[PDB]
Paper text:
Asparagine synthetase ([name]) catalyzes the ATP-dependent biosynthesis of L-asparagine in cells from l-aspartic acid using l-glutamine as a nitrogen source. As seen for the bacterial homolog, human [name] is composed of two domains.
In order to determine the molecular basis for the binding selectivity of [name] inhibitor 1 and to provide a firm basis for future, structure-based efforts to identify potent and selective [name] inhibitors with simplified molecular scaffolds, we determined the high-resolution crystal structure of human [name] by X-ray crystallography at 1.85 Å resolution. Conditions were then identified that gave a single crystal of the [name]-modified enzyme, which diffracted to 1.85 Å resolution. Two molecules of [name]-modified human [name] were present in the asymmetric unit as a head-to-head dimer in which the two monomers were linked by a disulfide bond that likely forms during crystallization. A cis-proline (Pro-60) linkage is present in the human enzyme identical to that in the structure of the bacterial homolog AS-B. Electron density for the [name]-modified Cys-1 side chain is clearly evident in each monomer. A hydrogen bond network, composed of the conserved residues Arg-48, Val-52, Asn-74, Gly-75, Glu-76, and Asp-96, which mediates substrate recognition and thioester stabilization in the hydrolysis reaction that produces ammonia, is also clearly defined. After refinement of the protein and ligands, a single 12 σ peak remained in a pocket at the interface of the N- and C-terminal domains on both chains. The site is surrounded by Tyr-78, Arg-416, Arg-245, and Val-417, and the peak was assigned as a chloride anion. Importantly for structure-based inhibitor discovery, the synthetase site in the C-terminal domain, which is composed of sixteen α-helices and five β-strands, is well resolved. We also observed density consistent with a bound HEPES molecule from the crystallization buffer in this domain, which hydrogen bonds to the Asp-334 side chain and water molecules in a network that also involves conserved residues Asp-400 and Arg-403.
Numbering used by the authors: 1 to 209, 222 to 465, 479 to 534
Write the structure that this text describes.
């Protein structure tokens, strides 16, 4: 789903009905645009991918009980039903996000956002109390960007590409920035439709309704929490599929997912999707897992020429120029295209978050202590929204698919992060050893995969021809912010700057 909203606009009917369409790709099933009674220079645009409640879930969500609340969100509130039941709320729709309205009316914004077990970016307008609220989930899984002017014009969107062509009177340049994960903002609505920020607030989770850490207890809890993470993510009336690369993380996801689909008596085969250059070791690993779990497996072969040819639109989708991110996004974009083209799988499970959470990257083998390693894991998790989780969202949403990432489950990730730092560093000499031991009695995946530790070259050779030595020598002059250090870096930056000239500070690093 793609959200777009303006408060305090000059003209949000004629010229900005057209700006709401820039993020259509995220939500192919339906579009609604509307303005606000009494505040007709404030408006919403919503592109829906209908995942829960096809008939009654169109947004802005507006229900009879709360005539002055307007909610637009991209997300999934996995614990909505148990809150609904505990508090005995009566829904008008059947959509998970309606819980946000009932909780807000009861307790305000802070006490609402801390209760949501899920992923989300939202905008909530309350015309009785004269407030606008922005919010984003803890790890930043679902995206949000914002722009605000001194006169009190506010514009928000799922992707920066829906903000950069807005023209506000008396601002020659509209500054666009990511909205920070794990924050809410409160803004005052003024009588003429402009807004003024009150506070931007970091929130933590609340309730919705050495001593210990023995290894058998830790492994048992991790199994249960991971299973729960996947189970709560079966919430959808659409077909669930799964990316399956043959790596440990996607394999554990695929295998646990199929087991949970069976327990729920789901009647469709699980479709799994791998992509690579043919005769890859990774593709054979993926096929091995597929046969072990019994999925309906699609193996997609990408061509060097196809990959290079996709860079332009991939960087357009991503809105960043980080080398690691751009490299990996080409394959994810192309597999997502294939999924949308060839199947009806819409809710796509993936393994992002695991490496950051479990200290799985090779360089963690060189960490000065368990506390310096633990700290680095915390920085990686805080920055996911710029990197791996940016890639995972932008490249699936580019083709009208919905990403789900169970490693970033709130209860599972919190429990793992609570573990003594010394149970989490590699003691045997293999990364993610605890994670592997957790699942070794399950027969969940083949033991060979459970214990396993030139697209890159083709990109080098291509950018070598596109960036000459003088361009590189001149790089600090042409690109003074986050200057590129390689020709690969330089090339991605040029593509980025052609789409988003002057926007390089979306990436801090
Ligand atoms: C596209 C999206 O965020 C889904 C919103 C809600 N869960 C739904 O309509 O399925
Ligand atoms: Cl998720």
């Amino acid at each position: 789903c793609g959200i777009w909203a303006l408060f305090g606009s000059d003209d949000c009917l004629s010229v900005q009905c057209l700006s709401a369409m820039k993020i259509a790709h995220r939500g192919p099933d339906a579009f609604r645009f509307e303005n606000v009674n009494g505040y007709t220079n404030c408006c919403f645009g919503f592109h829906r991918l209908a995942v829960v409640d096809p008939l009654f879930g169109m947004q802005p969500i507006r229900v009879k009980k709360y005539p002055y609340l307007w909610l637009c969100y991209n997300g999934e509130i996995y614990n909505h039903k148990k809150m609904q039941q505990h508090f005995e709320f009566e829904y008008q729709t059947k959509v998970d996000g309606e819980i946000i309205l009932h909780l807000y009316d009861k307790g305000g914004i802070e006490q609402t956002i801390c209760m949501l077990d899920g992923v989300f970016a939202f905008v909530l307008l309350d015309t009785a109390n004269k407030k606008v609220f922005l919010g984003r989930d803890t790890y930043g899984v679902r995206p949000l960007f914002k722009a605000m002017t001194e006169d009190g014009f506010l514009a928000v969107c799922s992707e920066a590409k829906g903000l950069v062509t807005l023209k506000h009177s008396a601002t020659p340049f509209l500054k666009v920035e990511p909205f920070l994960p794990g924050h809410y903002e409160v803004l005052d609505l003024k009588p003429n439709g402009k807004v003024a920020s009150v506070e931007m607030v970091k929130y933590h989770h609340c309730r919705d309704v050495f001593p210990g850490f023995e290894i058998e207890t830790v492994k048992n809890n991790l199994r249960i929490l991971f299973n729960n993470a996947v189970k709560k993510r079966l919430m959808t009336d659409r077909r669930i599929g799964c990316l399956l690369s043959g790596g440990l993380d996607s394999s554990l996801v695929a295998a646990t997912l199929l087991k949970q689909l069976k327990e729920a008596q789901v009647q469709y085969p699980l479709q799994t999707f791998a992509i690579g250059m043919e005769d890859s070791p990774d593709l054979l690993a993926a096929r091995k897992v597929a046969d072990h779990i019994g999925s309906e497996h699609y193996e997609v072969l990408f061509n060097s020429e196809e990959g290079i040819q996709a860079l332009d639109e991939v960087i357009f989708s991503l809105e960043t120029y980080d080398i690691t991110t751009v490299r990996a996004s080409v394959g994810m974009y192309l597999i997502s295209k294939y999924i949308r083209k060839n199947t009806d799988s819409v809710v796509i499970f993936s393994g992002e978050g695991s490496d950051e959470l479990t200290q799985g990257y090779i360089y963690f083998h060189k960490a000065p202590s368990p506390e310096k390693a633990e700290e680095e894991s915390e920085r990686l998790l805080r920055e996911l929204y710029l990197f791996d989780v940016l890639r995972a969202d932008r490249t699936t949403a580019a083709h009208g698919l919905e990403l789900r990432v169970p490693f970033l489950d709130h209860r599972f990730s919190s429990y793992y992060l609570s573990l003594p730092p010394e149970m989490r560093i590699p003691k045997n000499g293999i990364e993610k050893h605890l994670l592997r031991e957790t699942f070794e009695d399950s027969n969940l995946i083949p033991k060979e995969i459970l214990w396993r530790p030139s697209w890159f070259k083709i990109l080098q050779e291509y950018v070598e021809h596109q960036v000459d030595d003088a361009m590189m020598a001149n790089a600090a002059q042409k690109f003074p912010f986050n200057t590129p250090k390689t020709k690969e870096g330089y090339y991605y930056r040029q593509v980025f700057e052609r789409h988003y000239p002057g926007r390089a500070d979306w990436l801090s690093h």
